[PDB]
Design an enzyme around this catalytic site. Structure first.
Site, PDB file in Angstrom:
ATOM      1  N   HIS A  33       0.818 -20.585 -14.356  1.00 20.49           N
ATOM      2  CA  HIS A  33       1.933 -20.279 -15.244  1.00 20.49           C
ATOM      3  C   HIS A  33       1.845 -18.824 -15.776  1.00 20.49           C
ATOM      4  O   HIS A  33       2.837 -18.270 -16.257  1.00 20.49           O
ATOM      5  CB  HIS A  33       2.111 -21.328 -16.366  1.00 20.49           C
ATOM      6  CG  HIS A  33       1.035 -21.276 -17.396  1.00 20.49           C
ATOM      7  ND1 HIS A  33      -0.054 -22.124 -17.374  1.00 20.49           N
ATOM      8  CD2 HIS A  33       0.858 -20.462 -18.468  1.00 20.49           C
ATOM      9  CE1 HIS A  33      -0.865 -21.820 -18.374  1.00 20.49           C
ATOM     10  NE2 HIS A  33      -0.324 -20.832 -19.066  1.00 20.49           N
ATOM     11  N   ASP A  63      -1.695 -25.730 -11.298  1.00 21.92           N
ATOM     12  CA  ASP A  63      -1.670 -24.647 -12.266  1.00 21.92           C
ATOM     13  C   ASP A  63      -2.757 -23.637 -11.984  1.00 21.92           C
ATOM     14  O   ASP A  63      -3.744 -23.551 -12.707  1.00 21.92           O
ATOM     15  CB  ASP A  63      -1.689 -25.127 -13.722  1.00 21.92           C
ATOM     16  CG  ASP A  63      -1.204 -24.025 -14.712  1.00 21.92           C
ATOM     17  OD1 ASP A  63      -0.965 -22.880 -14.258  1.00 21.92           O
ATOM     18  OD2 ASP A  63      -1.055 -24.310 -15.928  1.00 21.92           O
ATOM     19  N   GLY A 139      -2.967 -17.501 -25.502  1.00 20.88           N
ATOM     20  CA  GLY A 139      -3.768 -16.368 -25.072  1.00 20.88           C
ATOM     21  C   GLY A 139      -4.943 -16.859 -24.258  1.00 20.88           C
ATOM     22  O   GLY A 139      -5.517 -16.107 -23.429  1.00 20.88           O
ATOM     23  N   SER A 141      -4.851 -19.298 -22.016  1.00 21.71           N
ATOM     24  CA  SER A 141      -4.431 -19.773 -20.680  1.00 21.71           C
ATOM     25  C   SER A 141      -5.192 -19.056 -19.573  1.00 21.71           C
ATOM     26  O   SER A 141      -5.426 -17.848 -19.648  1.00 21.71           O
ATOM     27  CB  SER A 141      -2.930 -19.535 -20.459  1.00 21.71           C
ATOM     28  OG  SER A 141      -2.173 -20.637 -20.843  1.00 21.71           O
ATOM     29  N   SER A 156      -5.116 -24.724 -18.770  1.00 19.57           N
ATOM     30  CA  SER A 156      -3.698 -24.834 -18.531  1.00 19.57           C
ATOM     31  C   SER A 156      -2.877 -25.007 -19.805  1.00 19.57           C
ATOM     32  O   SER A 156      -1.999 -24.210 -20.097  1.00 19.57           O
ATOM     33  CB  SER A 156      -3.402 -25.940 -17.501  1.00 19.57           C
ATOM     34  OG  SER A 156      -2.001 -26.248 -17.408  1.00 19.57           O
TER      35      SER A 156
END
Lengths: 185, 51
Positions: A33, A63, A139, A141, A156
């Site tokens: 993402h 992801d 932040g 991720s 994720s």
């Protein structure tokens, strides 16, 4: 630069997952993402230190994403912060794990379930996720989930925060390594 | 930012900040909208970017 450090795209900030390689070609993994719709990646908010360009992106359903390094001089540590990573492994229920992210730093917890489905809404559904009781915040991720010297997953999403506690889902790193034919070092 | 499609059970964790009427910087739109729902519609968007 190493696992957990900040990475910036044209759109926002995520965290570097793991530095990986194929032959003599270096890349880094992060969340899909984050790579979705991103081309170039930088090491700083000023966008003065280039890292590389997006080479693959898989989100939703999975992801994960991968970025090919174009910066020839920046150190590409095979670690997570100071922690050496020497292999990858599959998560198991009850496993003690640790996450490092660019917003919250390092936090630990355990794997509470496997093969979880997470619906981010609007048709963005991801499958086969590792469920944990580790917190994470915006932040974080794409940052690494590891266990000792073993790479386990990529951050994720989920709910809650590090103050009150939360649930974070991770993409199994083995699946990403296999898809791209890369390995940790 | 429209929060009518919320709440959502999970949010991704990328950082693209929004500034709420409570002077708190919300990390991304999903975190912001879930907070709006949690406040029963009292929280609103002050401006984009950090507070």
């Amino acid at each position: 630069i190493s696992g957990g450090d900040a990475i910036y795209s044209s759109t926002g900030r995520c965290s570097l997952g793991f530095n990986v390689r194929s032959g003599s070609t270096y890349y880094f993994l992060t969340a899909g993402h984050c790579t979705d719709g991103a081309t170039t990646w930088w090491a700083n908010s000023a966008r003065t230190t280039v890292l590389g360009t997006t080479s693959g992106s898989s989100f939703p359903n999975n992801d994960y994403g991968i970025v090919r390094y174009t910066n020839t001089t920046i150190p590409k540590d095979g670690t997570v912060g100071g922690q050496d990573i020497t292999s990858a492994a599959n998560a198991t229920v009850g496993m003690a794990v640790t996450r490092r992210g660019s917003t919250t730093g390092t936090h630990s917890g355990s794997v509470t379930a496997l093969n979880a489905t997470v619906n981010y809404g609007g048709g963005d559904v991801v499958y086969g996720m590792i469920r944990t009781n580790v917190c994470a915040e915006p932040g974080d991720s794409g940052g690494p989930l590891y266990s000792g010297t073993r790479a386990i997953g990529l951050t994720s999403g989920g709910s809650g925060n590090c103050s009150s506690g939360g649930t974070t889902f991770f993409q199994p790193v083995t699946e990403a390594l296999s898809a791209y034919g890369v390995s940790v070092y | 930012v429209d929060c009518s499609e919320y709440p959502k059970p999970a949010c991704t964790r990328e950082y693209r900040p929004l500034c709420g009427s409570d002077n708190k910087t919300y990390g991304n739109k999903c975190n912001f909208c879930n907070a709006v729902v949690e406040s029963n519609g009292t929280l609103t968007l002050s401006h984009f970017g950090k507070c």
